[PDB]
RNA sequence: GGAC
């Protein structure tokens, strides 16, 4: 029915906040910091959980970390978890100072809200797997800034493997850089949402700021 | 070049 995929459209449209709030200059100030965590990680100063490593794709876990995908033994709803208190590496002063302290300005999030900042750095043709980010872990809403190049958030695809093959999105969200993408009800709990290797062509590097539940599972 |  045409009525049945405009009502889902609507529903994911709903949840979705996102408006340029970077300048260049503040996004090159910012990716030059993003740069020296590559190379901070590269250095072995980071404790062993704060980087997670794939092909085209690392994972920079700071305040908190999740385990995902194939770390998980049985992998399936509710069977992600956080790390040990203390082990992942502190957010950064620059985070804090640079990131959070214009959403928290600008009224994107209450202050106090953000405790997990991780850092998603793609090389070209990366990609990430259809995905709800787990309920039982994290609060909404969720608040991401891209960097390095302008993409493409998809939701409700469906991925297919050697070679990746991904189905039509239900909606592509564009995302430039220096915008921030926020998620919410319907966008964030009831429906998946991906990047594809299509949609990366250039290096991509966005900070994804959270808040944890209480109850929050840990190792 | 793999979070459902
Ligand atoms: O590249 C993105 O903005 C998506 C990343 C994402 O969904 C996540 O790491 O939870
Ligand atoms: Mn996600």
């Known amino acids: 029915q045409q009525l049945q995929k405009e009502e889902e459209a609507r529903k994911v449209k709903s949840g979705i906040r996102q408006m340029r709030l970077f300048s260049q200059d503040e996004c090159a100030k910012i990716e030059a910091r993003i740069d020296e965590?590559?190379?901070?990680?590269?250095?072995?100063?980071?404790?062993?959980?704060?980087?997670?490593?794939?092909?085209?794709?690392?994972?920079?876990?700071?305040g908190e970390g999740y385990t995902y995908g194939a770390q998980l033994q049985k992998r399936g709803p509710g069977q992600e978890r956080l790390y040990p208190p203390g082990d992942?590496?502190?957010?950064?002063?620059?985070?804090?100072?640079?990131?959070?302290?214009?959403?928290?300005?600008?009224?994107?999030?209450?202050?106090?809200?953000?405790?997990?900042?991780?850092?998603?750095?793609?090389?070209?043709?990366?990609?990430?797997?259809?995905?709800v980010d787990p309920i039982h872990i994290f609060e909404r809403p969720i608040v991401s800034v891209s960097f390095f190049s302008d993409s493409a958030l998809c939701f409700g695809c469906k991925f297919q493997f050697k070679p990746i093959r991904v189905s039509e999105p239900v909606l592509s969200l564009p995302v430039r850089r220096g915008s921030v993408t926020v998620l919410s009800g319907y966008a964030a709990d009831e429906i998946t949402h991906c990047i594809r290797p299509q949609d990366i062509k250039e290096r991509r590097a966005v900070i994804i700021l959270r808040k944890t539940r209480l109850d929050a599972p840990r190792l």
């Not at 965590?37 to 250095?43: C, D, G």
């Not at 009224?107 to 900042?117: L, Q």
């Not at 793609?122 to 990430?128: A, E």
């Open 37 to 62: 965590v590559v190379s901070r990680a590269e250095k072995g100063l980071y404790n062993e959980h704060t980087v997670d490593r794939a092909p085209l794709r690392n994972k920079y876990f700071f």
């Open 88 to 131: 992942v590496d502190e957010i950064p002063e620059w985070v804090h100072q640079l990131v959070i302290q214009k959403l928290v300005e600008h009224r994107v999030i209450p202050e106090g809200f953000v405790n997990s900042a991780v850092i998603n750095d793609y090389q070209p043709g990366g990609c990430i797997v259809s995905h």
